[PDB]
């Protein structure tokens, strides 16, 4: 019942109660994989599917294949995703999309083109039926064909190096029209990872990190911030926060304020704003067109949060 | 217009008929209606083959929806009552072709024809079987409306005392059985068993159809016998527009074996059917039965009018079981050992190829096959055996090379050239001598194949011993490609010079030969020539670019100055080839070209529109993010061709170019707001359109534009 | 964690090379498909077949999971890494000529 | 200054089949003489009307086309960027068997006459092939067609040498002995000089004029 | 004057002609 409500956090504990007490038929374990995939915890999903990949029925592991392949893709272990991909049924939309992305990793551009075309016709039947009722009903399939058109631009991204400055401009504004759903952005952003690493575009991941914290899980929004910084500020508290990437560290301080630290964030905010003035000055090079204006804009936000937080604390 | 059509129809009615029908179809499509109808009525009344051919040629070209269906329905029923000669078979096919056009009255006509054929079910039964088979092939869905009465009618018509009538009923029954199996088995088995207990060929034909339907393993071998790159290639930068039977098996096999053993010399239709039924039984039911089948085939192998049937049956049995024919293959080899030397021979090579699919028997059999003759079947069988079983590749190559060299020493020579250029061999002496056939032989057929094999025989393409010869033979091809009288020979020469020869066509002397081909009378050669020089232009720009600038202005001159719809269509197509093949040179010329094409679209003829839209598709890929100021004024033109389309023209090009200029410009989410109808019409194209190519394009356009949430759709209404 | 492993036999080196009686060599030619052949080989020294798609073209023409390969498209690959074999087959033509050990239920 | 309106005015009233046809053609012949070199500014504006006279003409004996072919010869060097679209209509006139003989005579004449002031080196295969399929077809056009071909071989240097086997086959079959064509082929097969072969036709014409 | 020498200059943003004088219509290979 919880799965039908798209409420997964209480669904996982419900399945754990029925399985931790006693092991049962391979139906409750399959339910957990549908919950771990939605939450986005590939580490726990990978160990479950790999260990259970042997002592299950041949038909049973056919359903497990699709979820296992997604877990391998998320962790970057391409040596095991190939094994899981070859067992997905080849007469389904998910059976062609998950092997089309495999060709891109191994640089098989001719093979991937047929797979993309093969997936379009399979998705056609599932789309015309849903489109006959209303547009809202036929949205879970339209987001699927949105991801197919992204794979074609991945092929173009890897071929012509001169276009890798407007390809990552369409992906920004095209994502501004999609519905603000954590699950929808999780798949779309995962596709835009075979070519562009998160460190190459913080403008997109910071928006996704804010979305997860604001309306979903704070735990997911926290791991996406330490990845951009490269170090975990939660490990050491005495040391000051990283100074580089001023936009990224600004979002991290607000996350501490929201969850549990309304005092440590205020102390770190004072240090961050103090170092900005010294960084702003003593700069012989002039970049007043973009950098100086952008730096000054961040100053106003940082000072504004200082007044609001101080009134709340004192 | 009418006098020539009437004269052509009379000439065709009385290869001349095929040429007249093809010319009439081309003229009718390019373009009076009353004169054609009157001529067809006179031809149909008087002769019969010409009238049916003219109607069939005009079917699917003029575009008759319902008006032509009614007139053709009356004519089709006129020839249905009487079973005329084999010429009338085309009329039945023409009726089926007309019924397959997809008309509203086609379903009613098919049902009416089925009811009429049911009453007939030998001037009536034979015609009904052919008509039913044609309707089933053309409209399988309409043939399933009444299948129970057809089976009962066929069971009674097949029992009539006739020989050729049963052949049509068996084919019709097999077609009906195939359609049923794709989507009655007990009834078919019971009817066959009742007739089994004149009644020889019909009973075997019904049993053979059931065996083939039940087991398709033997059908694949028969189809193959009758008939006889890479996943890592980067895409081009600018892509241009594109059960019961299994249970009653032992009893049927026993009954068939008894009939074959008993009716050995008592009954040719039965003998032919027995051999055909034997391969089906051997594959389905695999040693007394095998030995008896081989003995019967061997007895009929030496019999007249049965060697071809026996040879095919023997090969099928060997493929089904290798151990059964492990020691019985020598009898076939011994029989064919002296038969080949003595020289009907087409079936001899087919039997060897079928039985091949052990490695020492073909070592000596190659010599007898070489002296048999040069036929397409012999070359296909030898090539298939070498690829499937390369036991002695050198021996097969040596024999083929020896025969080819002797043949070329002095129409039969054309086949020898085709074999040399067909598959790989183990050749500098041949290419030098191959450059003499087309320079002396006046036959048009021999020169067409001589040109093709020369290019494919130039595989070895840093030592000054082979550069001179390849540069020498390449000179003759260029000369023939521009100095040949008929355009057919010139067309194939230029097609042979593909992208592979890029490094050798950049020489100064070779460039002059290509420059002549640019100004040629036939457009098919100019279209091919301009594409070649465009790719060759980026290699030697000192020669090509000065000539292209004069040519480029002439292409744009014809678009505006010449007010002819045919010339403008002609020039626009050539413009697309130049930009799609040499993007770097055309990139600085975006403004003069785009403005000319845009003014063409807003002219106050389907040919021009289908080509200018395709050309803009390639122009949107070469100039990334530069075609930004014309998208706003280009959507209006394109969208009107999709939404509120007053004419059901070709919307595939408009849909293809719409999604092609948004994946490069970057205009993705904005158009959903300015035009609050684009999302709705694209969804409607899914249900309305049935073409697979168009459907796969509408999905891509939806993905490229975006996946906007349903709420914003409500805001945009 | 990362690997799974399928075949019971730990090692088959120096055993396939000898004229082994239980097994009998067979050669399989597999035609390409619109989405791929559907077989994976993950054997270090012998390059054994890891998994086969039951609905794939390979499964139609035999190609069972418990098999070993020694030569591909003519070239002998009896002693190479599994990754090298994967590189060779991809670079080769769509149709692949494969030799399978096909152990006779032993 | 007033030539813009005159060309525009003639566009409407030049109906394809009407009594006012010859005066329009006669008006063109007087205009080209008057401008005498700058007529190319207004020539493309009247090309589309002139194009549909060589394929849509109901005059008896195609007199209208013949009266128009004589006007093209007066253009001379005025047309240089418009020869690509005006030549194919001319070459389509003398290869059609159904065309009247006098009309086909003028089409052959208007090419050799136009050769004296234009360069036809580029348009070699465009008009050589229609000629070689007319010699074997019409036994009455042998004399006039060879003059047009001979007038074209003169412009071409040694590049015509590759076309000799095409024409030599037709000549031996029909026994055509043309004096001028015999001279030109001899100078190409066997050398004459070096400064004369592969010579630009326009340079030679200017040299003779001066 | 050599292919090896031209590669060194290309690294330092110096271009050079890569054709001889025997043919006056060079073609980029
Ligand atoms: O949720 P908040 O703490 O109030 O932060 C908001 C929010 O920023 P995030 O993108 O980090 O969530 C807004 O973004 P939206 O999700 O509403 O689009 C952003 O507005 P913009 O997208 O226009 O930049 C706005 O920024 P600003 O203050 O410049 O208006 C910013 O507010 P704070 O930076 O003050 O927290």
């Amino acid at each position: 019942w919880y799965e039908k409500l798209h409420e997964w956090e209480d669904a996982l504990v419900a399945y754990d109660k029925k399985m931790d007490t006693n092991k049962d038929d391979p139906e409750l374990m399959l339910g957990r994989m549908r919950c771990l995939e939605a939450l986005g915890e590939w580490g726990q999903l990978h160990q479950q599917c790999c260990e259970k990949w042997t002592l299950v029925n041949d038909e049973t592991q056919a359903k497990m294949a699709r979820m296992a392949a997604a877990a391998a893709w998320g962790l970057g272990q391409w040596d095991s995703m190939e094994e899981y991909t070859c067992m997905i049924p080849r007469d389904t939309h998910d059976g062609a999309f998950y092997r089309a992305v495999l060709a891109l990793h191994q640089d098989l551009f001719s093979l991937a083109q047929q797979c993309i075309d093969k997936a379009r016709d399979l998705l056609d039947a599932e789309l015309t039926a849903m489109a006959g009722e209303s547009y809202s009903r036929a949205y879970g399939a339209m987001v699927s064909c949105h991801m197919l058109s992204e794979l074609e631009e991945v092929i173009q991204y890897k071929l012509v190096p001169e276009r890798r400055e407007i390809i990552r401009q369409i992906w920004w504004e095209r994502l501004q029209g999609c519905q603000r759903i954590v699950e929808d952005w999780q798949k779309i952003l995962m596709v835009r990872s075979l070519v562009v690493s998160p460190h190459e575009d913080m403008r997109t991941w910071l928006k996704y990190a804010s979305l997860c914290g604001k309306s979903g899980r704070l735990a997911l929004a926290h791991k996406t911030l330490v990845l951009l910084l490269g170090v975990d500020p939660s490990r050491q508290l005495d040391h000051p926060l990283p100074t580089v990437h001023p936009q990224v560290t600004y979002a991290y301080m607000k996350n501490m304020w929201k969850s549990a630290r309304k005092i440590d964030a205020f102390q770190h905010m004072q240090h961050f704003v103090q170092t900005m003035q010294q960084q702003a000055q003593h700069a012989i090079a002039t970049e007043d067109q973009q950098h100086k204006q952008e730096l000054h804009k961040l100053m106003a936000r940082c000072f504004l949060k200082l007044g609001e937080w101080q009134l709340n604390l004192q | 217009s009418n006098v020539s059509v009437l004269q052509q129809f009379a000439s065709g009615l009385k290869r001349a008929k095929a040429a007249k029908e093809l010319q009439h179809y081309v003229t009718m499509e390019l373009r009076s209606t009353r004169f054609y109808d009157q001529l067809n009525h006179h031809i149909f009344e008087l002769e019969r083959k010409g009238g049916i051919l003219a109607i069939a040629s005009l079917i699917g070209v003029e575009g008759g929806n319902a008006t032509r269906i009614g007139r053709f329905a009356n004519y089709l029923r006129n020839l249905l009552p009487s079973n005329d000669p084999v010429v009338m078979e085309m009329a039945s096919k023409a009726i089926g072709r007309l019924a397959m056009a997809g008309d509203t009255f086609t379903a009613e006509y098919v049902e009416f024809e089925v009811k009429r054929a049911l009453e007939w079910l030998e001037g009536r039964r034979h015609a009904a079987v052919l008509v039913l088979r044609e309707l089933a092939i053309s409209v399988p869905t309409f043939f399933f409306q009444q299948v129970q009465p057809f089976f009962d009618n066929i069971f009674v018509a097949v029992w009539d005392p006739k020989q050729a009538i049963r052949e049509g009923a068996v084919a019709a029954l097999r077609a009906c059985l195939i359609l049923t199996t794709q989507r009655w088995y007990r009834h078919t088995f019971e009817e066959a068993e009742k007739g089994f207990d004149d009644r020889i060929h019909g009973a075997l034909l019904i049993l053979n159809e059931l065996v083939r339907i039940s087991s398709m393993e033997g059908e694949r071998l028969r189809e193959e016998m009758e008939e006889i790159m890479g996943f890592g290639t980067k895409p081009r930068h600018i892509t241009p527009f594109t059960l019961v039977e299994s249970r009653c098996c032992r009893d049927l096999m026993e009954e068939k074996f008894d009939q074959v053993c008993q009716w050995v010399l008592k009954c040719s239709l039965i003998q032919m059917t027995i051999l055909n039924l034997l391969p089906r039984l051997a594959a389905f039911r695999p040693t007394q039965y095998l030995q008896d089948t081989m003995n019967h085939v061997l007895s009929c192998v030496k019999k007249e009018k049965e060697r071809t049937a026996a040879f095919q049956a023997l090969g099928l049995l060997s493929v089904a079981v290798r151990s059964e024919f492990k020691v019985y293959l020598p009898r076939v080899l011994d029989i064919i050992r002296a038969a080949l030397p003595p020289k009907v021979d087409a079936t001899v090579f087919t039997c060897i190829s079928m039985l091949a699919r052990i490695q020492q028997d073909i070592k000596e059999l190659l010599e007898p096959m070489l002296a048999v003759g040069l036929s397409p079947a012999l070359t296909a069988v030898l090539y298939d055996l070498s690829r499937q079983i390369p036991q002695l590749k050198k021996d097969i190559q040596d024999g083929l090379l020896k025969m080819l060299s002797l043949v070329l020493m002095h129409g039969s020579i054309t086949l020898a050239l085709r074999t040399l250029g067909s598959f790989e061999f183990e050749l500098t002496q041949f290419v030098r001598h191959c450059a003499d056939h087309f320079l002396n032989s006046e036959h048009k057929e021999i020169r067409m194949e001589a040109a093709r094999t020369c290019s494919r025989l130039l595989t070895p393409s840093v030592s000054q011993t082979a550069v001179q010869v390849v540069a020498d033979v390449l000179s003759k091809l260029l000369v023939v490609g521009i100095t040949d009288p008929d355009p057919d020979i010139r067309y194939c020469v230029l097609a042979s010079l593909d992208e592979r020869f890029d490094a050798h066509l950049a020489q100064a002397e070779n460039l002059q030969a290509l420059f002549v081909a640019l100004n040629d009378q036939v457009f098919e050669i100019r279209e091919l020539a301009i594409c070649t020089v465009g790719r060759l232009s980026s290699m030697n720009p000192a020669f090509v670019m000065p000539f292209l600038r004069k040519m480029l202005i002439q292409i744009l001159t014809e678009l505006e100055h010449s007010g002819i719809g045919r010339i403008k269509e002609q020039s626009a197509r050539m413009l697309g080839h130049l930009v799609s093949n040499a993007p770097r040179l055309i990139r600085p010329y975006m403004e003069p070209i785009l403005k000319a094409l845009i003014l063409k679209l807003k002219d106050p003829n389907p040919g021009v529109i289908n080509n200018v839209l395709a050309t803009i598709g390639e122009l949107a890929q070469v100039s990334g993010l530069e075609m930004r100021k014309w998208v706003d004024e280009l959507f209006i033109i394109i969208m009107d061709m999709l939404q509120d389309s007053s004419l059901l023209a070709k919307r595939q090009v408009a849909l293809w170019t719409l999604g092609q200029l948004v994946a490069s410009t970057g205009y993705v989410v904005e158009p959903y707001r300015k035009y609050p109808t684009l999302l709705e019409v694209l969804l409607n194209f899914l249900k309305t359109e049935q073409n697979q190519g168009t459907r796969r394009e509408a999905i891509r356009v939806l993905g490229l534009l975006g996946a906007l949430d349903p709420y914003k759709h409500k805001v945009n209404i | 964690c990362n690997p799974k492993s399928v075949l019971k036999r730990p090692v088959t080196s120096e055993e396939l090379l000898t004229p082994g009686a239980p097994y009998a060599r067979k050669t399989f030619t597999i035609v390409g498909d619109a989405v791929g052949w559907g077989f994976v080989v993950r054997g270090s020294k012998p390059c054994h077949i890891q998994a086969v798609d039951p609905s794939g073209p390979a499964a139609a023409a035999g190609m069972k999971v418990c098999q070993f390969v020694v030569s591909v498209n003519g070239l002998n690959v009896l002693h190479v890494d599994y990754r090298t074999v994967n590189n060779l087959i991809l670079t080769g033509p769509r149709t692949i000529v494969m030799e399978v050990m096909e152990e006779l239920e032993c | 200054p007033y030539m813009d309106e005159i060309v525009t005015l003639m566009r409407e009233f030049w109906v394809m089949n009407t009594s006012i046809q010859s005066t329009i053609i006669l008006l063109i012949e007087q205009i080209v003489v008057a401008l005498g070199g700058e007529f190319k500014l207004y020539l493309p504006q009247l090309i589309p009307h002139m194009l549909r006279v060589f394929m849509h003409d109901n005059s008896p004996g195609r007199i209208v086309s013949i009266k128009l072919l004589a006007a093209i010869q007066l253009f001379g060097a005025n047309l240089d960027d418009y020869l690509h679209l005006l030549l194919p209509p001319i070459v389509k006139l003398f290869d059609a068997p159904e065309a009247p003989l006098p009309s086909r005579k003028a089409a052959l004449e208007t090419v050799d006459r136009l050769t004296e002031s234009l360069d036809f080196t580029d348009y070699a295969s465009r008009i050589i092939h229609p000629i070689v399929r007319t010699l074997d077809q019409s036994p009455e056009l042998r004399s006039t067609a060879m003059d047009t071909l001979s007038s074209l071989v003169f412009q071409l240097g040694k590049k015509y040498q590759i076309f000799i086997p095409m024409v030599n086959k037709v000549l031996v079959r029909h026994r055509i002995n043309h004096q001028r064509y015999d001279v030109l082929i001899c100078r190409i097969v066997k050398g004459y000089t070096l400064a004369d072969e592969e010579e630009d036709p326009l340079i030679y014409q200017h040299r003779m004029l001066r | 004057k050599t292919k090896q020498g031209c590669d060194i200059l290309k690294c330092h943003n110096w271009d050079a002609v890569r054709h001889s004088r025997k043919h006056l219509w060079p073609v980029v290979p």
Side-chain angles (χ1 to χ4, degrees), chain A residues 180 207 210 214 250 254 301:
Chain A
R180 304 182 65 90
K207 208 66 178 180
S210 176
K214 179 164 55 183
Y250 170 75
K254 295 191 305 182
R301 276 75 179 178

